[PDB]
């Protein structure tokens, strides 16, 4: 079976607005979300629907952009690095599960290049 998706809201966590967090939602997430290669990354990988029975043998930290978007929207992240870590986990999950050169991998590589171009201009801490 699939695991439950990652948590996206916790009312007991403290909340802050920061320029870094705003940029991560309004520039980084938004830019990747609208990209023509985004759709396979907009929700959790459904290993049941996609017939990937071994997916969770190696992917012990699932992540996707739908989860990241919701986390940003619900003030789940305190430090910008928490969000950056989640993007990076999404990419690196893809590269450990899927054969090099598979279409999903080439899509993730293009998205990661774009992510790094946007993260380059992240506001200071």
């Amino acid at each position: 079976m699939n695991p439950p998706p990652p948590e996206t809201s916790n009312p007991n966590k403290p909340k802050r607005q920061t320029n870094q967090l705003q940029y991560l939602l309004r520039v980084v997430l938004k830019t990747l979300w609208k990209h023509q290669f985004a759709w396979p990354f907009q929700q959790p990988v459904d290993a049941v629907k996609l017939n990937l029975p071994d997916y969770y043998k190696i992917i012990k930290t699932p992540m996707d952009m739908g989860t990241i978007k919701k986390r940003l929207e619900n003030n789940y992240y305190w430090n910008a690095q928490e969000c950056i870590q989640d993007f990076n986990t999404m990419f690196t999950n893809c590269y450990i599960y899927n054969k090099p050169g598979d279409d999903i991998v080439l899509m993730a590589e293009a998205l990661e290049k774009l992510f790094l171009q946007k993260i380059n201009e992240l506001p200071t801490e």
Binding site: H35, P40, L52, D54, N98, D102, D103
Partner: peptide
């Protein structure tokens, strides 16, 4: 063992 070939979105 993989997800197959992919189509792009709009």
């Amino acid at each position: 063992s993989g997800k197959g070939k992919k189509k792009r979105g709009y």
